[PDB]
């Protein structure tokens, strides 16, 4: 296939994405969920890991690590310690609200994904670290887990396979940094959500000291559909090394902000004008698109005309795919006010552990707050660039990178607008 997009409704993983069907167990089993789960479990860990490696599933959390390669880090003998699958249901990214829709509307798909994935990785239980702000979704998920226990689908002799597997839900308490997998581990362990250093990776030392795989809600929930439909079905969508389907959250300055499941390498312009009704005021009213939530660099209108919405074509467009959360910004936007608000978010959501983020993200927020007013000089733009290059790569987790990249995208694509802002400040205040 050469052009991508226009996904059919029969080829959807997240049926009942919109809350239009029964999310409970009798509705979920009537939509293909929990069907032949025992036959998936009995074929061993190696078969399930091979079906995930065949499918080409990458990490839907946003970094895009190969999911089968990541989950095969647990295919190793027991050293006395138990093993844990941990579902990352935090979703603190601005723009991103897809995991809320999975937990709220397809919860049994997440529970079956916990069972199948923890069977693949030999795990003992599933700790679903859900966001603390998602209370109704957490009780929603707990109702589904009660329905899964009472049907014998999980717990003692899960689905009649002789495999014991629990599913726990831990609520967060209001920290974006607790979506980072090691800080999420530290938050489950009852401490401040500060990220660990790597190595040890969580497959070696994870939650409680155990072998542990943290994986996103989407990359876990699509795994029983990969096991039932086959890995080649999932690899038959999107470009090569960009396989599958993907949830997209188009918000901001579009006519109909919405969540949509779409084929992987869909064009951005087609996605916006097909599922969201296009940019408000027309496509010529488009100023910028933050393609994948707040951490990715923005791209202007001259990149959004031709770009594909997968990992590799956005890396080649000097941005990232991230969480596939499309924030659309029209010509009426003070883009410096939006990016400075985004940097303000990253200094409010920063755990204070290491030096470059703790100091430099606040220092970038002060510089961006002066750039909104134009209370600066153009030699501070390049300086700000250097500050971002001192935060990027030198921090413990990638929130320093995710704070550096909006600054770098704004400078790289809108340096003249910053310079005219500052020179008009200078000529109206002197």
């Amino acid at each position: 296939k050469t052009s991508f997009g226009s996904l059919k409704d029969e080829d959807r993983i997240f049926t009942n994405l919109y809350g239009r069907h029964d999310w409970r167990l009798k509705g979920a089993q009537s939509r293909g969920d929990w069907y032949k789960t025992k036959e998936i479990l009995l074929k061993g860990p190696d078969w399930i890991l091979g079906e995930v490696k065949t499918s080409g599933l990458r990490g839907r959390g946003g970094a895009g690590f190969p999911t089968g390669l990541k989950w095969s880090f647990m295919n190793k003998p027991s050293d006395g310690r138990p093993k844990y699958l941990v579902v990352n249901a935090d979703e603190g990214e601005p723009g991103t609200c897809k995991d809320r829709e999975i937990i709220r509307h397809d919860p049994h798909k997440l529970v079956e994904g916990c069972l199948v994935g923890g069977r693949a990785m030999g795990a003992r239980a599933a700790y679903i670290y859900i966001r603390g702000e998602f209370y109704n979704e957490a009780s929603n998920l707990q109702v589904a887990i009660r329905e899964a226990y009472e049907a014998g689908l999980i717990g003692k002799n899960a689905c009649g396979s002789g495999y014991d597997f629990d599913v726990f839900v831990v609520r967060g308490a209001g920290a974006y940094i607790c979506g980072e997998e090691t800080a999420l581990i530290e938050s489950i362990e009852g401490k401040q959500g500060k990220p660990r250093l790597k190595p040890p990776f969580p497959a070696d030392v994870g939650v409680f000291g155990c072998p542990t795989t943290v994986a996103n809600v989407e990359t876990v929930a699509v795994s029983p559909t990969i096991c039932r439909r086959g890995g080649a079905w999932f690899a038959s969508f999107g470009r090569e090394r960009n396989s599958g389907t993907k949830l997209f959250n188009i918000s901001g300055h579009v006519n109909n902000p919405c969540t949509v499941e779409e084929e992987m390498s869909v064009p951005l312009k087609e996605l916006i004008e097909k599922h969201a009704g296009g940019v408000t005021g027309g496509w010529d009213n488009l100023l910028a698109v933050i393609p994948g939530g707040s951490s990715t660099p923005l791209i202007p209108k001259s990149v959004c005309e031709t770009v594909l919405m997968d990992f590799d074509a956005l890396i080649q467009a000097q941005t990232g795919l991230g969480t596939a959360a499309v924030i659309v910004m029209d010509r009426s936007t003070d883009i410096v006010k939006a990016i400075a608000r985004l940097i303000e978010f990253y200094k409010h959501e920063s755990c204070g552990q290491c030096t470059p983020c703790r100091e430099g993200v606040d220092w970038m927020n002060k510089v961006m707050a002066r750039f909104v007013r134009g209370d600066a000089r153009p030699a501070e733009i390049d300086s700000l660039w250097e500050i971002s290059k001192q935060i990027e790569g030198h921090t413990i987790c990638a929130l320093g990178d995710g704070a550096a990249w909006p600054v770098q995208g704004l400078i790289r694509h809108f340096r003249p607008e910053l310079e005219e802002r500052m020179q008009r400040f200078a000529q109206q205040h002197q």
Partner: protein, 213 residues
Amino acid sequence: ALFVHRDTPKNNPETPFDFTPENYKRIEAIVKNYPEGHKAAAVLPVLDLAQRQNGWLPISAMNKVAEILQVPPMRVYEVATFYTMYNRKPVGKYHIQVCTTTPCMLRNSDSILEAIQKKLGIKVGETTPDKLFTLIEVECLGACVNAPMVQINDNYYEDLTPKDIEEIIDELKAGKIPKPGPRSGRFSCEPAGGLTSLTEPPKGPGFGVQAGL
């Protein structure tokens, strides 16, 4: 907004806090979710339970969570001051949380923040004199396609206009509890002018299942 504690007469280690017995059974069920020997992993739920029984956290809820989990009290103080939900001051009975990040600021959450301010007569951080409404300004609540939106105590009120949040505040003052949903026409997250996808009926069990399973 501070991160050191000073003993007021209403916030001290002699402030009366204690769990109800049904909350003690809830704490037992919480601690049974974690391995034997890692009881400290129950700091974040139980302390949040102390915020649901009491409304806020004095420094006797923190010391009680420290005592019943056999953890040092500083390890509960760190959790209480790290995570933004734990109210270390008393908030109003309805805790209005306006999201003002970029996907909501682009869809005019400023007008709704102004509407709540000019309605309640307060500003951000202040509590109304009847102790019913506390207005603060929070980061991304994870409901970005339903922007603009607020959170009240469990609930997301979404796709709001200033009239809609005025009406929600009017019926919160009247005692009723509103419906946590988008105040526009749509239901959860669909496109607002009809479904662009998932119009066909879902297939059901057995569809597309590979051979050898």
